[PDB]
Design a protein around this ligand. Structure first.
Ligand code: HEM
Ligand code: HEM
Ligand code: HEM
Ligand code: HEM
Ligand SMILES: *Cc1ccc(OC)cc1OCc1ccncc1
Ligand SMILES: *Cc1ccc(OC)cc1OCc1ccncc1
Lengths: 141, 146, 141, 146
């Protein structure tokens, strides 16, 4: 559950992220595949080499989903219904994997925002990713 | 914890640039701010009411140095992390009853801190090597659960 | 995130607890206390011996809170806000303990309501307790 | 994994009444219904589209028996879980990569199943005895992941 402040931090920092969102999502994915090879078993048909166009393309998609989430922070289950169906009903992604991508997304964030990744923003973005993760790993249809 | 020849190499290269007097403190401090329930184990540390109080808390900085030290120990003994942390494991598991899951969280927070300091220098390959090291320490600290 | 069916299963299964609420809550607490000693440091002043009158009364409070949570299942954050302050703000209970009591609640239910504790309901009750646990361990004030 | 002679007796006594042809299939099946993502590891079992389909799946009932059997082996070697489960540990960690947490989940599910079948007989103390055993099996299986 996000606090009023949490929402303010997540919106502010993601605003800061701005146009670099797709890149960051791509980098997050890459860090995940390299750091936790197991996660690769979910993208068999993907070219997971450094800089591949598929990973970058998928990152944009991931970032757009998150930007969408940020924009409907108070109504995520509804806004992410289709994505939840995909990760929870169909792909049946183990939630441990969401902790891993989230962590990688924070790491990427820390690596790109030396001036804005404050402790509070870090805390708020952590809870935010946890909330998105819960929606996507839950079958509520 | 295996770290290829190239990995252990990079891990060492980077840790050489890590500030022994501050990183520990930043990691522990962010742990207390990001995962608030962990504050329960530090009532004797003083004010931890706001993120500014936490990050600026002398006990947190002072204690974080000890923590950063245990990690430096692990780095010089990557082949026996279990032995290296045996004592700390007893303290954390049998004495403080700190759930194993938090060792994992502090470990990732450390990784975040490292990324914060080195920026682009903290390449995916560099992180990948470090995830091996923190999982080792974490698994080692919880070994009193086997 | 609960599905419409989860709410159906939970309200149905919990309704059969009824007047047993206090008793069952006490049994869960006790099971927790014996199976996971660590959880006891949270009640240092309590008399935790078998049959304790304190444990009995407390389970009754825990049991009623869950009944209130089932009623406002679609409005939990506002409904359990005070319990949130308590467990997250004042007590700072480590989330791991919430999985332990939940497990003990399920075990207790299974042992008292065999016919009702079907796979599906078991699944719903678990998610319900996890959502309640999320709320009680989150600072959204 | 340290059980007092009294727990050893109660655990052995209770397990004697377990239906080795059912309990295991019921526990494995509940694992797949309560924690849906675990189905990913069993996609070759066939239809798992609904609770009833899972609980009625032959392959699920058959595999369940083996699981129960292993737990049985463990109950006959609480003195050396790690050793008894060295083989399974490699299968689940090195070959399958099942996250250690799922081992804990299946363990608690089994406890739920036992409580379901014995009701009031599955007393708080007996449960405690069992939490120890399933905690041991899990930690032994997670030996290649812990
Ligand atoms: C931060 C949480 C995540 C978000 C916001 C997210 C978002 C998305 C989006 C936007 C898509 C594309 C949907 C489409 O096909 O139209 C997708 C697909 C997918 N996601 Fe996620 N995802 C997340 C986490 C994960 C995790 C943790 C895994 C597993 C490690 C995962 C595995 C997949 C897979 C396998 C696909 C389908 C790939 C394909 O066949 O093209 N996702 N995700
Ligand atoms: C996984 C990395 C960890 C390492 C390497 C580590 C290291 C240390 C070290 C070196 C000590 C000092 C022992 C001494 O000076 O004799 C210590 C003490 C302690 N640690 Fe950790 N620790 C870790 C994680 C944690 C976590 C996650 C918690 C719980 C949230 C925690 C809570 C404590 C407490 C309460 C004490 C100090 C008690 C006091 O002085 O009042 N530690 N730790
Ligand atoms: C389904 C989960 C839970 C529910 C519904 C719940 C509910 C409650 C309720 C209703 C109270 C009574 C407060 C009052 O009457 O003012 C309370 C107090 C308390 N709870 Fe929880 N609780 C849950 C889990 C936990 C867990 C996991 C722990 C710790 C292991 C915990 C520790 C406490 C403590 C220590 C108190 C204060 C008792 C005292 O010092 O007087 N609770 N809880
Ligand atoms: C409580 C711990 C568990 C025990 C005691 C256990 C025991 C076993 C045993 C006896 C086998 C077959 C041995 C053989 O290869 O002949 C097996 C296989 C297997 N187990 Fe486990 N297991 C446990 C938990 C899990 C969990 C949590 C998962 C994953 C969600 C899992 C997934 C599997 C899979 C996929 C196989 C291969 C079955 C097949 O596809 O043919 N196990 N396990
Ligand atoms: C707020 C919150 C913190 C931590 C977790 O655990 C991953 C979950 C969570 O809430 C998830 C959620 C958000 C919005 N609607 C439903 C569920
Ligand atoms: C639905 C659900 C599944 C698993 C968890 O544990 C992380 C939580 C959860 O619900 C979260 C929630 C429920 C109700 N209001 C806010 C958040």
């Amino acid at each position: 559950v996000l606090s009023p402040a949490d929402k303010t931090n997540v919106k502010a920092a993601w605003g800061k992220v701005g146009a670099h969102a797709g890149e960051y999502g791509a980098e997050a994915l890459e860090r995940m595949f390299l750091s936790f090879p197991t996660t690769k078993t979910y993208f068999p048909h993907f070219d997971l080499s450094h800089g591949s166009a598929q990973v970058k393309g998928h990152g944009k998609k991931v970032a757009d989903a998150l930007t969408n989430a940020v924009a409907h922070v108070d109504d995520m289950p509804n806004a992410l219904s289709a994505l939840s169906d995909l990760h929870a009903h169909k792909l049946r992604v183990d939630p441990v994997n969401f902790k891993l991508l989230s962590h990688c997304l924070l790491v990427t964030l820390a690596a790109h925002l030396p001036a804005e990744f404050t402790p509070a923003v870090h805390a708020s973005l952590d809870k935010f990713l946890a909330s998105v993760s819960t929606v996507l790993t839950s079958k509520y249809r | 914890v295996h770290l290829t020849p190239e990995e252990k190499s990079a891990v060492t290269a980077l840790w050489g640039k890590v500030n022994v007097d501050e990183v520990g403190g930043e990691a522990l401090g962010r742990l207390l701010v990001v995962y608030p329930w962990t504050q329960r184990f530090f009532e004797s540390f003083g004010d931890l009411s706001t993120p500014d109080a936490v990050m600026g808390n002398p006990k947190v900085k002072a204690h974080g140095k000890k923590v950063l030290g245990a990690f430096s120990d692990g780095l010089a003994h990557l082949d026996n992390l279990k032995g290296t942390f045996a004592t700390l494991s007893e303290l954390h598991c049998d004495k403080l009853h700190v759930d194993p899951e938090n060792f994992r969280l502090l470990g990732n927070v450390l990784v975040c801190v490292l990324a914060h300091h080195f920026g682009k220098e903290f390449t995916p390959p560099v992180q990948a090597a470090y995830q091996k090291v923190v999982a080792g320490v974490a698994n080692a600290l919880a070994h009193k659960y086997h």
